[PDB]
Structure 1
Amino acid sequence: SEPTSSSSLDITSNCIIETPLQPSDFLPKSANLFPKFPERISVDSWELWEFDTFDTNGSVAFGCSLYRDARGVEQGGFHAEVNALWPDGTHWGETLYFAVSEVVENSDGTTGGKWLSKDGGSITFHIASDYTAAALDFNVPGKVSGTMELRNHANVSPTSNLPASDAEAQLCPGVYYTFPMGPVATSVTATFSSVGANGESRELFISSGYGGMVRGWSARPWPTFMNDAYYVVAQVGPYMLQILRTLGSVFVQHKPFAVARLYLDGSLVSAANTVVGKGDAVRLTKVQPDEKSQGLSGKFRDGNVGYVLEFAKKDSEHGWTFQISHKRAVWSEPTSAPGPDGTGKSGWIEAISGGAKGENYEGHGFGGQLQIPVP
């Protein structure tokens, strides 16, 4: 509970270098929660600690992505992307900025994080030494206050499933993207200062909610390996799934990449770090509204109404397939100038069905898709 490792960066006091930085090495069988760029970042480098929640029916969602990268220097802070959805369709969403990001590892092996702004507002996290619990405290004046908790209850420990090699931790060479907590039950108690029309509103998820945690980092900037991405975490009957799939920019010859994990009754049954042309592999196919009647489209040039997600087992014909349809729109922000080819990012409360061949379990997910106009 005394700090034994400490990284503290102040984006307003010269911690950005304009040439590449190599991160600290990946640690096998660790959740690698301590920053990999501990003293300085480059204009390219990024680190992500992400915690999302939603209730079992998908009527409410609350997510928080904490970043260290240089995108927010002009706003004076590291990014904290906070998004909330109520049962009535109201959405609250902001990129919040915090001049200081401090992450410590304590002697007991717990990890603490603190995004701190000059006015004293903060978002903090605290993660158990064995990665089975995470707690966030929000204290952002005039924006959002409250708490979020994620807990793993599975039989097999988080540690048992942690990547043992760089390949198992990687989206692609040099891009690390990991789901170290696996299946989590969630709870939220939060208050938002102004929602919809200048009014305060509270939000609750009770210890019975779903969600997921993401730990990611890279020296490589996103445009150099992707121009389209999809992320979701979901519960579909007894299945717990989590996936990031990128579609490459021209700088990786438009190659797709994915990191994906599938649990069944709390046990890992599929781990994929490759796309169907190591462990397993995944295929992710966009669904168009001329193919499937149910599902919203986002507001930009990507008109898909959902996806088909297939987990293919290495040895066999036995796999798992999930139909994902966009059920409720969360966030929506452009990533280019408007127009017929304008791109953007859209968050979703997904309706998902499927499982093994013949199965038709039904559940929900929380995630989002993004394009940026990189060739």
Structure 2
Amino acid sequence: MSNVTVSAFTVDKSISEEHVLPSSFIPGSGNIFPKFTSAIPKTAWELWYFDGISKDDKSSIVIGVTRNAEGLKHGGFKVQVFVIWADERTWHRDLFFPESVVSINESGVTDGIWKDATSNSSISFSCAGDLSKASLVFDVPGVVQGDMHLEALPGDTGLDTDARLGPSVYYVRPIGRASVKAQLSLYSSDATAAEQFSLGTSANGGMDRVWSPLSWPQVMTESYYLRTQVGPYAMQIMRIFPPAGSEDQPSTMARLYREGQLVCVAQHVVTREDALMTHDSLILSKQDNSDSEDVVTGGYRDKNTGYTVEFVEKGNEGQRWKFQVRHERIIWNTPTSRPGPDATGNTGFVEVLCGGTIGESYEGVGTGGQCELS
């Protein structure tokens, strides 16, 4: 009943056994529309990611809307929802929907609807054509109901930058920098009680769009995610280490903004400020200050308490921005191996940051995540 372009998947019919090639990356675009349009191969995956974190009280919300075959045994395509309250209570669900539909409508809005007709449940996202905002509607009775809204902050969009994350993954950032609001009713597992969640004030966040034809262990052994507003600064980092047995350099899709102006476009990871002066570069190193009072580690074999971030502008005269990243609160700990002293895992953090150029000590909070595969 309207002039739509549509990719309608069901978990029963859209998972292919043969290998499929995805449509190509659209430079300068949010790439919101799915790249595996008719069927998705067993190893491939697609991600629509949204988060926000309150500078005022450190409440935070994290949404992963995915297509991939791993949910097949679970009854559909997975959506992940994590929240942490100001008081560090947490809530989480993996939700599986048989139907996933992404469409572009007559006004240019791209809508994604993950639905489960027989439980009257759905989670949807909606991206404005100009990516000036995106909103989500949670409608899962007895589980989660409410909405989330992201508004793009003024300035450069960063969409005219390289989105490759190594040779097998594309990491696009449709909304790099946004203000965020979220209100949810969150139910207990038995659905007899519900708690209210309101994202705190002065919340920042954004939206990322990620996809690959290869499984996670085929593209990386470890990843670090970070998104934060630090006074005038805003930065988004994804850094991976190459898969086991490879010998590539680490990869990164890392960006630094100042007053909304994109000032460092780092596609390379280095260990030293002079290692690669022909390119904007990133130094990302773990820290271990287990004696500090305001720090946490993940719940697996990585005992790092934080990271040092340094953006190194290109050139002999290039600027340098350095930020300390301290893990302050645990949003989630989920395993990527069987239990044990050497177990690996995936941890989400409320991060606290401080830094800038020399002579600056701006502060903010951010969302962090680290995953180590085995």
Q: Which interval holds the TM-score relative to the shorter structure?
A: over 0.9
Answer yes or no: is 1:233 the counterpart of 2:227.
yes
User: Structure 1 residues 302 and 251 mapped into 2: Cα distance closer, same or farther (>3 Å)?
Assistant: same
**Partner residue in 2 for 1:372:** 373
User: Structure 1 residues 29 and 254 mapped into 2: Cα distance closer, same or farther (>3 Å)?
Assistant: closer
**Partner residue in 2 for 1:139:** 139
C-alpha distance in 2, partners of 1:246/1:70? 22
Displacement of 1:314 in angstroms is 1.0
- Contact 1:62 1:85 (C-alpha < 8 Å) held by counterparts: yes
RMSD after superposition: 2.0
Answer yes or no: is 1:337 the counterpart of 2:338.
yes
- Contact 2:134 2:151 (C-alpha < 8 Å) held by counterparts: yes
SS in structure 1 at match of 2:175:
coil
**Partner residue in 2 for 1:258:** 252
Displacement of 1:223 in angstroms is 0.7
Answer yes or no: is 1:64 the counterpart of 2:94.
no
- Contact 1:239 1:265 (C-alpha < 8 Å) held by counterparts: yes
**Partner residue in 1 for 2:110:** 111
C-alpha distance in 2, partners of 1:2/1:187? 31
- Contact 1:224 1:251 (C-alpha < 8 Å) held by counterparts: no
C-alpha distance in 1, partners of 2:58/2:174? 26
**Partner residue in 1 for 2:20:** 21
**Partner residue in 2 for 1:85:** 84
**Partner residue in 1 for 2:209:** 215
User: Structure 1 residues 349 and 110 mapped into 2: Cα distance closer, same or farther (>3 Å)?
Assistant: same
SS in structure 2 at match of 1:250:
coil
Answer yes or no: is 1:328 the counterpart of 2:325.
no
CA displacement 1:110-129 (0-9 Å, x = unmatched): 10000111312111111111
**Partner residue in 1 for 2:243:** 249
User: Structure 1 residues 292 and 90 mapped into 2: Cα distance closer, same or farther (>3 Å)?
Assistant: closer
- Contact 1:58 1:365 (C-alpha < 8 Å) held by counterparts: no
- Partner letter of residue 160 of structure 2? P
SS in structure 2 at match of 1:223:
helix
User: Structure 1 residues 292 and 313 mapped into 2: Cα distance closer, same or farther (>3 Å)?
Assistant: farther
**Partner residue in 2 for 1:123:** 123
Matches within 5 A, 1:97-108: 97-108=96-107
SS in structure 2 at match of 1:172:
coil
User: Structure 1 residues 263 and 196 mapped into 2: Cα distance closer, same or farther (>3 Å)?
Assistant: farther
- Contact 1:225 1:251 (C-alpha < 8 Å) held by counterparts: no
**Percent identity between the aligned chains?**
37
C-alpha distance in 1, partners of 2:184/2:362? 31
**Partner residue in 1 for 2:152:** 152
C-alpha distance in 2, partners of 1:87/1:196? 24
Answer yes or no: is 1:362 the counterpart of 2:363.
yes
- Contact 2:168 2:219 (C-alpha < 8 Å) held by counterparts: no
SS in structure 2 at match of 1:184:
strand
TM-score, scaled to structure 1: 0.92
CA displacement 1:8-40 (0-9 Å, x = unmatched): 1111x2322223221101112211100000110
Stretch of structure 1 that moved more, 80-89 or 246-255: 246-255
User: Structure 1 residues 67 and 153 mapped into 2: Cα distance closer, same or farther (>3 Å)?
Assistant: same
C-alpha distance in 2, partners of 1:111/1:61? 25
- Partner letter of residue 23 of structure 1? P
**Partner residue in 2 for 1:352:** 353
Answer yes or no: is 1:163 the counterpart of 2:164.
no
Aligned counterpart for 2:195 among listed residues 177, 194, 201: 201
Stretch of structure 1 that moved more, 252-261 or 178-187: 252-261
- Contact 2:308 2:324 (C-alpha < 8 Å) held by counterparts: yes
**Partner residue in 2 for 1:319:** 320
User: Structure 1 residues 3 and 184 mapped into 2: Cα distance closer, same or farther (>3 Å)?
Assistant: farther
User: Structure 1 residues 198 and 346 mapped into 2: Cα distance closer, same or farther (>3 Å)?
Assistant: farther
C-alpha distance in 1, partners of 2:349/2:259? 25
Aligned counterpart for 1:269 among listed residues 255, 263, 274: 263
User: Structure 1 residues 137 and 281 mapped into 2: Cα distance closer, same or farther (>3 Å)?
Assistant: same
CA displacement 1:93-114 (0-9 Å, x = unmatched): 1111111110011232210000
C-alpha distance in 1, partners of 2:10/2:249? 36
C-alpha distance in 2, partners of 1:320/1:198? 50
SS in structure 2 at match of 1:71:
helix
> Unmatched 5+ residue regions in structure 2?
none
- Partner letter of residue 362 of structure 1? E
C-alpha distance in 2, partners of 1:298/1:281? 27
CA displacement 1:337-365 (0-9 Å, x = unmatched): 00111011111100111111232111100
